[PDB]
Amino acid sequence: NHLSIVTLEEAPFVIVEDIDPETCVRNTVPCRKFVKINNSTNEGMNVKKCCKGFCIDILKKLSRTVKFTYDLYLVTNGKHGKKVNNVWNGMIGEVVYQRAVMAVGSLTINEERSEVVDFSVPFVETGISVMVSRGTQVTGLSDKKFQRPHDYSPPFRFGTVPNGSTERNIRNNYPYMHQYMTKFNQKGVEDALVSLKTGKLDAFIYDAAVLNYKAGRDEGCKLVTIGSGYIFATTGYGIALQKGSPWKRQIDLALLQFVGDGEMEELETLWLTGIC
């Protein structure tokens, strides 16, 4: 009944804040982040932090509907999840190696992750989108500018944030495009957005849900997703649970009840709506 839950900061899904002077107030819940003392030790401290957002509100509703208590912590071993030397890091790894009962966040459902963890029903539609400056002509992922980049002089500058589900898919589907674009690897979303606006990058390939959120709140509506905010390889965010977890049935029914009761639309209205 008292479950260990892992999460990761990715606004507006999960937003991390400092504790107020002296705990977590209002729409926020307590989360803990293990912070190292130094790099010549394995010692660290669990800093009390506060968490909010679309995914945190889902966790609150699940907590009262499914009837469970939880201790929320933030992943420090990588991010979302990557299989390095046949070993999983990130939120996926925390669930695979049973350090967490479940993973809640902007966690993309894909085939390789579904072989090692169980995912709930999707609760946010996502996949791959392309963010460009308004007016940029790119048909889609299959555009020659992306597919055969060196046919263009100068070539089109495009990148992603590596080690997530987006880079994985690109690696598997477009080997040549992938090896060319690693030169334009971005540290995070904020870095990528700055790079686009200042003309240092032409396209940013990333998670459809985060890209459409950022496009909607962009100052001057300069940055757009290609097509009608088109999604390639459509999937969803889901709750990762352990294989054969006794929690799945009740988690899926509760999420589907929130969809049917109108609660999901209220969450989309608070957290996800934008101007553009």
Partner: protein, 282 residues
């Protein structure tokens, strides 16, 4: 194993056609010049409620049939396709005792082993069956005749109805149970329950014939219909998001691999190919 697959007529997911004289299917080419893979499906001919149902061999093809063939060859299984006898998607209706109808009924009673159709994932169905991860993400929209001025779901001609502007959905479908169980949608359900149609095709026909002023249904179907008939349009975008999944019994040994095949198909473009073939053209 030899899986009994149940499906429903629903363009462009499942086209249903009579066989030729010799019980075979006429050869056809897609919009891209590739041959159309057709299957023999058995189903009733007469669609009149409360009448005897005479089952006949028919030809089935479409987005969902190509998906069936892909799943069958990926997981190495054989199948027999049949059309749902009552021609319904499936809802649980009160008879204290509540019973399932449609494809849902056929799956739970053992008449079918699997649902391969545009079947919406919802709380009600998920309590009794296993759904795969969605093979299509979409939602609800409204179809009207070109010229009919309607804003969308919050339009006064739907929110505050009269007999002057008639709107409806398909009986015993997920749209029908969505309006029934949502207290905010109560006034709309009260209007719709006197006008609901037996099938999506009859409702689409009624909108063309000016008998139905608005049809509330799945966007994957309505956007396709509007892209084919110039006298029809959809109004607004989606007012509610939903997805289609494959349906199996909770004891099925195919559950894990059905979902992995679906995820694989979205990731490698097979799902995008199906949309290029059956959904997005004109």
């Amino acid at each position: 194993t030899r899986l009994k697959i149940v499906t429903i007529h629903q363009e462009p997911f499942v086209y249903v056609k009579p066989t030729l004289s010799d019980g075979t299917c006429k050869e056809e080419f897609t919009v891209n010049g590739d041959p159309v893979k057709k299957v023999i499906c058995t189903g009733p001919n007469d669609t009149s409620p409360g009448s005897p149902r005479h089952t006949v061999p028919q030809c089935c093809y479409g987005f969902c049939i190509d998906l069936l063939i892909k799943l069958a060859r990926t997981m190495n299984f054989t199948y027999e396709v049949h059309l749902v006898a009552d021609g319904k998607f499936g809802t649980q209706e009160r008879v204290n005792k509540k019973e399932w109808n449609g494809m849902m009924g056929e799956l739970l009673s053992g008449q079918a082993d699997m649902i391969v159709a545009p079947l919406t994932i919802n709380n009600e169905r998920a309590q009794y069956i296993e759904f795969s991860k969605p093979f299509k993400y979409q939602g609800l929209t409204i179809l009207v005749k070109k010229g009919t001025r309607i804003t969308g779901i919050n339009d006064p001609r739907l929110r505050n109805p009269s007999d002057k502007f008639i709107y409806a959905t398909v009986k015993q479908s997920s749209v029908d149970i969505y309006f029934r169980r949502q207290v905010e949608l109560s006034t709309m359900y009260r209007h719709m329950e006197k006008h609901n149609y037996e099938s999506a095709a009859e409702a689409i026909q009624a909108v063309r014939d000016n008998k139905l002023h608005a049809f509330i249904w799945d966007s994957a179907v309505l956007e396709f219909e509007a892209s084919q008939k110039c006298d029809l349009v959809t109004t607004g975008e989606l007012f509610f998001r939903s997805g289609f999944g494959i349906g199996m019994r909770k004891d099925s040994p195919w559950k894990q691999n059905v979902s992995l095949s679906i995820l694989k198909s979205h990731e490698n473009g097979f799902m995008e190919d199906l949309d290029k073939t059956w959904v997005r053209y004109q």
